[PDB]
Amino acid sequence: LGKLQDVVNQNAQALNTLVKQLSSNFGAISSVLNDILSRLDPPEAEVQIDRLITGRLQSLQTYVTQQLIRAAEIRASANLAATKMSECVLGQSKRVDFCGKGYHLMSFPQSAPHGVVFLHVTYVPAQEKNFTTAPAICHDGKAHFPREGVFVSNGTHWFVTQRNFYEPQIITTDNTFVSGNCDVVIGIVNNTVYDPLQPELD
Amino acid sequence: AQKFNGLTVLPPLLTDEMIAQYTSALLAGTITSGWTFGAGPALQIPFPMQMAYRFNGIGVTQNVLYENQKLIANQFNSAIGKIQDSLSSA
Amino acid sequence: CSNLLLQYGSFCTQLNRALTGIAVEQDKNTQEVFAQVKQIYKTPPIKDF
Amino acid sequence: LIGAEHVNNSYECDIPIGAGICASYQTSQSIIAYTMSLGAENSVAYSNNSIAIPTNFTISVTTEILPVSMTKTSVDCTMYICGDSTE
Ligand SMILES: *[C@@H]1O[C@H](CO)[C@@H](O[C@@H]2O[C@H](CO)[C@@H](O)[C@H](O)[C@H]2NC(C)=O)[C@H](O)[C@H]1NC(C)=O
Ligand SMILES: *[C@@H]1O[C@H](CO)[C@@H](O[C@@H]2O[C@H](CO)[C@@H](O)[C@H](O)[C@H]2NC(C)=O)[C@H](O)[C@H]1NC(C)=O
Ligand SMILES: *[C@@H]1O[C@H](CO)[C@@H](O[C@@H]2O[C@H](CO)[C@@H](O)[C@H](O)[C@H]2NC(C)=O)[C@H](O)[C@H]1NC(C)=O
Ligand SMILES: *[C@@H]1O[C@H](CO)[C@@H](O)[C@H](O)[C@H]1NC(C)=O
Ligand SMILES: *[C@@H]1O[C@H](CO)[C@@H](O)[C@H](O)[C@H]1NC(C)=O
Ligand SMILES: *[C@@H]1O[C@H](CO)[C@@H](O)[C@H](O)[C@H]1NC(C)=O
């Protein structure tokens, strides 16, 4: 895991750098402040003490700025994770390529140390077949358009299937609607409609 | 320049050329397949099919595109010319 | 000048690591935007759309 | 770059270098440098009366990694900056 390891390693190395900062003189003649107190008088060793104060203050200010920036990016990541929770897990999100690569169904959150993961369940097609399509069917001068599917042909006859699955069905009135005349679409094909009311009225 | 004082500029990992190649491949995917290539394998589709599907996505029935497809194509071409002319004029 | 820089080598290490992080995140920003697909789709020679 | 031979073929790279060229360890075997391959160069057959309707699906699971918190630390000047001295 990379996104959960850097947030710990960078913090650990920042704490280690803070520890290492006390081992430097910052231009003074000793690192520990007790040494100059023991070997030099406080009236004379005031400037070295003040230099150590300035160096430690600069190191603390740099660490505070770094921690503020890390907290800002952690806040942004937490807001993103909360939105991903509330959309992908607590419902189904219509945003494409947001809850994983594919058509999202649901996500399963899992606890993580100083983090969170989401177990997205996507819907990707596996096998596809090439087909010849047409926007409209000219039956009796009226152009038929699919309500939710698309006209497809296997070479001899025509069917209508949904967008993400191949479910061939007979061209009928229940899944098609008419609009206008036949001479409005640049590409149209001639066929017939089942009209499943005609055989039942006999 | 600004490199004489050692303020060295790191070259990017991706140059302009393969960024342009990425954009061209994405354009080809979105004009030849719509959104199938962004959520799985690319599926071939006619462009008016995709246009009617985008129209269906905003609550407009797909029967209106094929009745005035030339008008929508001319409007799209005019809009492309307009954005090109506006960008040429920062 | 380099002799007195051992007292602030920790500061220098922090600055160098910060710029290295800036550079690597600037590199990764382009990968998260343009590299959405892993297959380069060629434009068909037919321009009749 | 020294210590890595240059080869004209292109693969997917793992160690980035910059300016569109990477380095990797392939076939004995030695470190080679090559231009990174943006992906599988394939063409999609496009036609005004050709469609592709999927007939099967695979339920896939995608892993995402997101941190939400970090270790809460408290720092005080008096026992960091100073030791056991009043001055
Ligand atoms: C295209 O689809 C049609 C409709 O399903 C197929 O025609 C049927 O094929 C089955 C398979 O032997 C026969 O039992 C039926 O009697 C056929 N019905 C009609 C009305 O012909 C056709 O075979 C399919 N063609 C291809 C190439 O797949
Ligand atoms: C689809 O059907 C229409 C009408 O049934 C056909 O249009 C006819 O075409 C013939 C000769 O091609 C003309 O003599 C008729 O006057 C046309 N009628 C109308 C109403 O336009 C059309 O040709 C058919 N298309 C195909 C490919 O068979
Ligand atoms: C859709 O894909 C799945 C996954 O490969 C197919 O399921 C396999 O079917 C074969 C033969 O029927 C079996 O030997 C495997 O054990 C099945 N695998 C699993 C994981 O169930 C399925 O048959 C495909 N469907 C169609 C219509 O092609
Ligand atoms: C369908 O046929 C066309 C050419 O006839 C081909 O380019 C395409 O790859 C085929 N589709 C599939 C899924 O095999
Ligand atoms: C598809 O395009 C080809 C080439 O321009 C053309 O010959 C054919 O008539 C077109 N088909 C339709 C249905 O528009
Ligand atoms: C790679 O192939 C090209 C093809 O012409 C050739 O010009 C070039 O010299 C080759 N590079 C190497 C390193 O062999």
Swiss-Prot record, chain B:
Described purpose of this protein according to its UniProt entry: Subunit of the fusion protein that is processed upon entry into the host cell. Mediates fusion of the virion and cellular membranes by functioning as a class I viral fusion protein. Contains a viral fusion peptide that is unmasked after S2 cleavage. This cleavage can occur at the cell membrane by host TMPRSS2 or during endocytosis by host CSTL. In either case, this triggers an extensive and irreversible conformational change that leads to fusion of the viral envelope with the cellular cytoplasmic membrane, releasing viral genomic RNA into the host cell cytoplasm.
Record protein name field: Spike protein S2'
Provenance organism: Severe acute respiratory syndrome coronavirus 2
Residues included from the entire protein: 852 to 944 of 1273
